[PDB]
Design an enzyme around this catalytic site. Sequence first.
Site, short mmCIF file in Angstrom:
data_model
loop_
_atom_site.label_atom_id
_atom_site.label_comp_id
_atom_site.label_asym_id
_atom_site.label_seq_id
_atom_site.Cartn_x
_atom_site.Cartn_y
_atom_site.Cartn_z
CD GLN A 1 -2.23 -1.38 2.64
OE1 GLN A 1 -1.62 -1.29 3.92
NE2 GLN A 1 -3.27 -2.24 2.96
CG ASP B 1 11.87 5.94 17.41
OD1 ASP B 1 12.12 4.74 17.66
OD2 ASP B 1 10.45 6.31 17.54
CG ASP C 1 9.84 4.59 0.01
OD1 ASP C 1 8.65 3.86 0.67
OD2 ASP C 1 10.25 4.66 -1.04
CG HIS D 1 9.77 1.93 17.51
ND1 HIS D 1 9.75 3.21 17.87
CD2 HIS D 1 8.56 1.72 18.08
CE1 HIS D 1 8.97 3.44 18.56
NE2 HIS D 1 8.18 2.85 18.61
CG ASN E 1 1.63 1.89 23.38
OD1 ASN E 1 0.79 2.90 22.57
ND2 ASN E 1 2.73 1.91 23.22
CB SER F 1 5.15 4.07 18.74
OG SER F 1 5.73 3.86 19.93
#
Length: 309
Positions: A4, A34, A43, A71, A169, A250
């Site tokens: 996608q 991070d 990309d 991540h 979370n 995240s």
Amino acid sequence: RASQQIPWGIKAIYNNDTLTSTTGGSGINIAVLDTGVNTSHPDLVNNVEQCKDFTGATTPINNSCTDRNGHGTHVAGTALADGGSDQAGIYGVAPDADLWAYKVLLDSGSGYSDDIAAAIRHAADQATATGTKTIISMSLGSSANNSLISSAVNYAYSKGVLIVAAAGNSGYSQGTIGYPGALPNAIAVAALENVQQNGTYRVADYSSRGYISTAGDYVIQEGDIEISAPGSSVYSTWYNGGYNTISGTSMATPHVSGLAAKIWAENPSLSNTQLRSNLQERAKSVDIKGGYGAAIGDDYASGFGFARV
Ligand SMILES: [Ca+2]
Ligand SMILES: [Ca+2]
Ligand SMILES: [Ca+2]
Ligand SMILES: [Ca+2]
Ligand SMILES: [Ca+2]
């Protein structure tokens, strides 16, 4: 190479089911604090601008930011992947923004508070040195409020940097929001899933919740959720090439920091506080009412609402 090119969360934040590409963000830096970022990803390579490591024996370590986790690469791609120089890759929210890849988390995905604080301050110092508008994006947090990180957030906010951070979370109980998201000077981001309830997107069960007493006034105090954005089942760039799907606040966080970059690049004379207000008003106009604790108006599950294009 991409299953996608326009993941569900990008279509949702753009409010366009048939979106074919994204746009915006030119001149805004998104400092992704991070696990590092895959610098040669097709990309992302056109947007990498800084690459620094805060996890080593001296700090910062320039020209080093290697992601061995995924991540950080994944978060970066949601904020600002540009489709690649062949337009065959995925798109993030603000594909024309600059990436400052600041590795503050070890390869395990956990990081030390002093390192995180150092990177927050360094991002601010780089904004000031370069004269360019900067957003710190932190897809990390802890139940506890570390004072090194807090003080760093205040420092950055005083230099004109916008801070965006994950709610956490640990939901869906009341009062599970973590830090730095829960700081007054940080925009805490809740996670939506691609499910409708009560006529709106639904907050994911895992997304950490704020507090009843200070919810409802559309003014951010400590402990309040601010923006909701897509966080569950998010396809993005991965550290060894390629793509992956992971979930969390995240993943929600870079939707918001990318949106903020897109808005700031339009409107580039805004202060961080004015930009923050523009984002808050976008969110307020899309009230989230689905998920535990979600309600009409500003609430402790979804904050002000879902800021969209
Ligand atoms: Ca720049
Ligand atoms: Ca350290
Ligand atoms: Ca906050
Ligand atoms: Ca409040
Ligand atoms: Ca609501």
